[PDB]
Design a protein around this ligand. Sequence first.
Ligand SMILES: OCc1ccccc1
Ligand SMILES: [Cl-]
Ligand SMILES: [Cl-]
Ligand SMILES: [Cl-]
Ligand SMILES: [Cl-]
Ligand SMILES: [Cl-]
Ligand SMILES: [Cl-]
Ligand code: NA
Length: 129
Amino acid sequence: KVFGRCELAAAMKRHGLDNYRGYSLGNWVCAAKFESNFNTQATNRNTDGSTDYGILQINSRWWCNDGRTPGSRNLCNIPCSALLSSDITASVNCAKKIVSDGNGMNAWVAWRNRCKGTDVQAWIRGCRL
Ligand SMILES: OCc1ccccc1
Ligand SMILES: [Cl-]
Ligand SMILES: [Cl-]
Ligand SMILES: [Cl-]
Ligand SMILES: [Cl-]
Ligand SMILES: [Cl-]
Ligand SMILES: [Cl-]
Ligand code: NA
């Protein structure tokens, strides 16, 4: 599923990400834009052989099981395919665990490079929330 900008903001807010660990909704929407272009089915292979899955490009190196990432963990206790569903519940619950792990949203390199310190509120502007 490819979400609309305000549609995703709404879904993210409903699932508890607005101001989760102090990150306003705009941060999460900005992150999703540059990670996946709002596409739940996005997948991208990493140099180390791991793969990133879904709207927030969650990595199989630590967070989910895809059966093909040697020496990895599955800390969210989910198959990576669950991260590609039109329903973002699994992605959100997993992102909550990740953002809580010590480094905040810096875990998402695209957030650090493209969203961090920017006017992220613009990503939720005009949205019925
Ligand atoms: O796209 C980077 C990333 C992968 C896995 C968890 C958080 C961030
Ligand atoms: Cl957009
Ligand atoms: Cl915001
Ligand atoms: Cl293994
Ligand atoms: Cl599994
Ligand atoms: Cl949803
Ligand atoms: Cl933080
Ligand atoms: Na594996």
